[PDB]
Design an enzyme around this catalytic site. Structure first.
Site, PDB file in Angstrom:
ATOM      1  N   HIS E  65       0.815  -1.203   0.000  1.00  0.00           N
ATOM      2  CA  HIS E  65       0.000   0.000   0.000  1.00  0.00           C
ATOM      3  C   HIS E  65       0.853   1.260   0.000  1.00  0.00           C
ATOM      4  O   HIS E  65       0.382   2.322  -0.391  1.00  0.00           O
ATOM      5  CB  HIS E  65      -1.016  -0.009   1.149  1.00  0.00           C
ATOM      6  CG  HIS E  65      -0.437   0.256   2.502  1.00  0.00           C
ATOM      7  ND1 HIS E  65      -0.055  -0.754   3.358  1.00  0.00           N
ATOM      8  CD2 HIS E  65      -0.240   1.414   3.177  1.00  0.00           C
ATOM      9  CE1 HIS E  65       0.345  -0.228   4.503  1.00  0.00           C
ATOM     10  NE2 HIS E  65       0.241   1.085   4.419  1.00  0.00           N
ATOM     11  N   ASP E  95      -0.141  -7.674   1.268  1.00  0.00           N
ATOM     12  CA  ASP E  95       0.378  -6.306   1.307  1.00  0.00           C
ATOM     13  C   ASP E  95       1.900  -6.217   1.506  1.00  0.00           C
ATOM     14  O   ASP E  95       2.390  -5.498   2.384  1.00  0.00           O
ATOM     15  CB  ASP E  95      -0.359  -5.552   2.418  1.00  0.00           C
ATOM     16  CG  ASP E  95      -0.079  -4.056   2.429  1.00  0.00           C
ATOM     17  OD1 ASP E  95       0.458  -3.518   1.437  1.00  0.00           O
ATOM     18  OD2 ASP E  95      -0.424  -3.423   3.454  1.00  0.00           O
ATOM     19  N   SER E 174       4.043   2.126   8.294  1.00  0.00           N
ATOM     20  CA  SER E 174       3.837   1.051   7.343  1.00  0.00           C
ATOM     21  C   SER E 174       5.122   0.715   6.575  1.00  0.00           C
ATOM     22  O   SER E 174       5.830   1.604   6.090  1.00  0.00           O
ATOM     23  CB  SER E 174       2.706   1.384   6.362  1.00  0.00           C
ATOM     24  OG  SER E 174       1.553   2.012   6.977  1.00  0.00           O
TER      25      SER E 174
END
EC number: 3.4.21.-
Lengths: 328, 328, 326, 326, 328, 328
Positions: E65, E95, E174
């Site tokens: 992402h 992901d 992230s």
């Protein structure tokens, strides 16, 4: 005074002649004394109404009366009275009140006829928007025979009048008059994303009003027929290619129940077994809720209506005799 | 029951309406969509509006924003019969569009064509349309102002000569007629100014004089040919910082009228520094302070014209000739 | 035209004849260029007004002018003029302006009479709603003698005319005329949850305006009688629970104090030593302020008025002589 | 593992040993099928709790159970059981449940002591935040003896433990344990503008919980002493302006009334006949309620306590005997 | 000034950080944009994130992402030097994404690879990333839970075996590493549960055991091959109305594994009526109540497998064999 | 008591030893008596601070003190005192207070050293979030040498400490201690979309604090150098390919003014004539605001700084001697 022109003079007059028939209605709610812990009556709403007859009967919107521990009507001259709820019809949002007042201070509005109305004729609305006592607003009949969602029950109200005369919160229950200084409807709602008048207002037509007020003064209730079914709304039925109205439930104790209409059930694996689907009711076709409602709106308790359903992949025809809606 | 004698004034509005409502139509904007359960191609309304019948050949006029983005169009006549509509053509700038219907010549009443150039503020107006889906709603008012310029975000490019009325105009009215007291088309209701998104008494109509021209051209050639200068410029609140007193030409395609004529676009010196280009400060002698002024000027021009545009370039102004060409 | 009707014909004529008297009013503020940061003047708001006389006096709402570095008025022919503030009355939201311009460019607006108005008659509003230069909206007188809260700051305005002629932000200061093409009121405010027109607009009556303009022209301010009392709002007189206007402070200088009204106090501990409480003024029963105000709003400086208070489980009557605020 | 550190090793062991005692609590409501419209039960909310003893008593917050048609508790091994409400105390947000299950499936949680806790020591919270079955969060005791407003309905809770171990919706009812792997408190609420954890969570002390569970098990309710007084909030004692708890109603039956406390009244007109006003209870000075409450919160039914009021520009001392609410 | 003696516990966390921060990187997601003034093609950051160095060959691992929708990627090393990054490949479902950097082999410290299968709740964890742009921020916590299943709207398809920690994890984290007390990679921080969009003590990491496999496959073949059943099904809160206790197969492309095997799609009988299709109720013996259950089942399957799927078809169930094939 | 483990014991102790040095600060604002019309002092804010020395000096965040008609500090034992504002530095959001208190009830926190801090070492925050008196929260140093926007002036504060110890509203002004029970910073702000602790908190480092408190107790003011220029923010300069800092104004009465730096002016046609652009200041390069700020942060009143500008398309070099910022 200066010389006023024909037209305005006519409305100046119409207003003075009829404003006396209009009244202010106060919906007092119960509130506590922060210290006394006892109670105080205190206004939670404001609306209008008009005098129906010399016996102190007052007409208004039911939604204006709903939930009032006590309600008081103020007359033209400001003398305020306590009012008893004679009765009411939630479907057509009409309500009747009674007050103990001297016949001399009571002008019943001249009752007109709504059946002959024509788009374009002038109208006069008198009410109390935002608490402004006996406000007059004028406009034109914008439309006739409109259907609007009651919200007072959700049930649709047929035959409604549309006007572009300014109609705001506080006008509900007041009169809509025609050029003859005659009652043609009760101002009751509007379409507006703001809650302010947007030029699209509705009045329950006088013709359906007069009947309801009679029945309400005689028996204090209006008796309306039922098929005895709870159906699915036009929406959550959309994704099923459902032509008419899907009956979800027909209680064994009601008309369609005793007549044997089938309800929607579940497969045993959990799937949906559609109950009957009403596609027509004696003559007139039914494609959705409005159609059904509209059609039964024409029946009377006791009528033996012949309804056509779409049962398990084959048509049907079933006679149901409408019974009064259970009381409470 | 027999109808009550109406006053002459109101009686007239009643005639005007009986006479013209049949020429008004309802238009449905359908778009292709995914069926939720069978993932198939479905036709589904995404918006509706108004329109009117122009000739016995089935030409329907309406606003362009109404038919915009449409996958399929259905127009419903007063008598509730519905036909499929083909797009004859449209003018995005004046938000006008013509549609063609294959319906019986007797079900088609062309609307009387009026004149907008000699209208006067205070004249009585009549609007017919379908606000909030309310079929052929009539709202009354007066001409509030003339020659208004409203920047329709429904193109961006401003529109001028527009009529302002206080007759209630709401979503659903777009594309319907605005009539004068003689019962003749004088404008097409298309937009309103409102904090609420609902009628607040300030509505606009594109004048009939502009519409006649455009419908005529669309029927005859399927399009309206409008000139261009061939430049992309900086919107106002974008250069308002630099003190630019005109249109800061951002791009003059070498392929277009302004480029082939020598106008210079804005540019960075590879050093990052923003070395801006020509700044238009007037065209045919008319001052150009903002993008609107430029627009208005071109509005009055024809294709093929040799417009002389002044530009602020490197510490001096200098007039350059540009020959306007049709839009591609 | 193609033969106008008599009624619409009258409107046409009325606008035609009076739009010349209306003006555009732009309120300019001082700002700062963001790159050069030099100060400059730019529009803060706009409104309308109208020409009062050949001397160049312009009338509008004070709230149109409040807090403006400079005022500029644009006449019907697009010519603008700088404007000087002659005076203004905050309680009735009326303000007079004076511009220096050609007598052949000033059409004094015909002045009408508001005391004789009747609900139902036709009205005509001219103003600049949403920047829409000289817009004409039309309606009827919907209500007379209305009382709307100070559409500027505080005190209730009385005798307000109510109308359903579309009135929108920008109409403030413009004229409301009757069918005789005469000034019957100044469009000044509205009731609306949207903030835009929904059918109930209010305009101060010409009779009230006539007086105030006159005063302002001459004394550059209008003198008003004051009682010399500060009191609590109708919402603080609730919990304590009593009909009347509670006196919270009677300045020994301000008439009421001279007379002997006692202000509210706090006893040794902290509880309320309930000062006086007005329940009537020489006749009229007071009970909230819309009252005290309403009534007192008709007195002149000097008028010795008897005020009925309450203190020791008994009522009393004090004689107070009205003076003006400084 | 690859050789854990002694400190983390202790956490690992503590969770390993006590996660068996924690449970999941699902609160089911009665709803209606939308097509068939028959009634059905569906989850209204969820929370956690823990096993108290081999009889199948489960402890949690009352607010986890409030308004639930049926209660179901899921044990650490995923097996569920219907739950009966044994009793609960609304003022301390503590509730006991009883399930019918295998004694070899109930690990009573080791019970610790809250009176000796010290700020700075390590705590361990186990619960089901966001449906995250038996989540372990870790932190320290951030504050002791805190007083947070009735995390259920009204009365202040006292002795609340404050911690910065992440506490989120769903943790309510679960245990807070000390480094000795013992129950020191019930995670019940938080302060947060977001509604989720921001470092300050509160849990009712085990000492307080121990008592209430015990009572509930036996009398199915816990008896509390009442004064028999209704009073105004700290915000209504402001404008009047005085330190103390104003008596608004002393029911002639409720002890305070028996004793002679006078309630607030309204005189002939409408003003306030200021009833009594408590400023002290047998020693401690009252002034708001967090006080009156705090203090009285340590008495037993019966305890004749002297209360210091105020009425006639003088103080006084009434002797009142505490009784229990019915 | 001389540093103060630190306790052994804290000293360790200090070593773990000195040792690993150099392996962490900052990643910039650039996208093509229009220059406002010179209307040219401009490169402009639209988002940033974290990542870590995998091998001496310049392979950077991060969440997908983070690099999604990117026009161009720049990774910045601890020493602030920045390199252009090429997408080696990625697995949208888990992901995870691998990037390649052409940087000096000495500026590259591969991160120690740990084990996630034997982790225990309560173990101490260490997160390094760039929350809110704060360069190589270290946040500490504990393992809060194991084997969590979070439905990442960043694919839709749920993810399982995920690690839950109470170490502060915020936007910007992230793609960064989650280390155990031994200073070894055990997960990659990728999402959090929060009403506020900010750390609330519930953060998730994709376990190293899942990542090792995926990075390996991406480096070696540029892709991860995952099996499919070849069906498009009705999301849960879409059929929850019908009582469907499984996956209501909406479409079984005749071209795919389920179609070639005979599964029947949902359909309307042209009569509008919705005639639904097969309803999967289990696959390799595992119950299928909702779309997640199906997902989880396939998760454990390999391509080429002959899965036996049960279906509720016309009043009876029946097991059908389907041979899973690679995703196109 | 039970036997507590090494670690927790260390923090239990650290807390008891130092909580006495922490204080509660109340910002009382003026409010009116609805009836008395006089005034009452009433809390509009809550914050913390610590005792700096035996002479009653209290340290806190300036933003906690801002706007207090009166302020009172409550000490450990709850004895509340009235406090005089000794002085304050808005740039580093540091403020000093003085109270008249018995030297026996005053523990000055042991002052530590922030220059040797290492990411990963433990920290202890004591303050009053949400009014919870002397709350302890622990965490780790997450980062060092961070720069954060002051908002107390907008000016950036350099060298800030980052910690994941819970920091909420009410913690400002309280101490951050290291494992030695020593003051390493003042908790002053956080990054959080909710306003609640999100695990990213900042403390002004003790080293810069100690200097400021000295200067504040001696002279009650801190004297900081200025160039005497108002520049354009990194944003509204973005669209100009501006490398460094654009000086918008250099008042003739200030340092760069007397040194002759040019301000931004207007073409006479309204265009923008860029003032000088600072690209470097004696040695260090300047690419934006932060760079300039940061660099001057190292200078002292009187320093003759050599600044390089980009004037009309050619470089420059100008010596400016920094003067104290005008008082008020």
């Amino acid at each position: 005074p200066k010389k006023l022109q024909t037209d305005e003079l006519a409305t100046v007059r119409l207003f003075q002649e009829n404003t006396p028939s209009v009244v202010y209605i106060t919906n007092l709610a119960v509130r506590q004394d922060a210290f006394t812990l006892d109670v105080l009556e205190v206004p939670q709403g404001s609306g209008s109404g008009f005098v129906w007859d010399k016996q102190g009967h007052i007409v208004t919107n039911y939604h204006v009366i709903r939930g009032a521990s006590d309600l008081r009507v103020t007359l033209a001259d400001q003398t305020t009275f306590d009012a008893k709820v004679v009765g009411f019809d939630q479907d057509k949002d009409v309500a009747v009140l009674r007050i103990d007042a001297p016949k001399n201070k009571l002008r019943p509005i001249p009752v007109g006829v709504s059946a002959d109305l024509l788009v374009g004729q002038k109208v006069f609305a008198i009410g109390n928007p935002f608490g402004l006592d006996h406000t007059l607003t004028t406009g034109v009949i914008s439309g006739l025979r409109r259907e609007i969602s009651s919200a007072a029950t959700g049930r649709p109200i047929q035959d409604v009048i549309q006007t572009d005369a300014a109609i705001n919160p506080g006008n509900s229950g007041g009169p809509l008059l025609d050029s003859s200084g005659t009652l043609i409807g009760i101002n009751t709602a509007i379409y507006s994303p703001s809650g302010a008048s947007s030029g699209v207002g509705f009045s329950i037509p006088v013709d359906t009003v007069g009947g309801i007020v009679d029945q309400l003064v005689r028996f204090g209730k209006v008796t309306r027929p039922i098929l005895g079914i709870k159906f699915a709304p036009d929406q959550s039925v959309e994704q099923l290619g459902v032509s008419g109205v899907l009956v979800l439930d027909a209680p064994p104790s009601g008309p369609a129940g005793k007549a044997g209409l089938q309800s929607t059930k579940r497969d045993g694996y959990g799937r949906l077994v559609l109950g009957d689907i009403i596609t027509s009711v004696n003559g007139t076709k039914v494609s959705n809720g409005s159609d059904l409602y509209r059609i039964l709106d024409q029946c009377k308790v006791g009528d033996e209506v012949t309804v056509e359903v779409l049962r398990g992949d084959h048509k049907e025809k079933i006679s149901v005799t409408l019974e009064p809606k259970p009381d409470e």
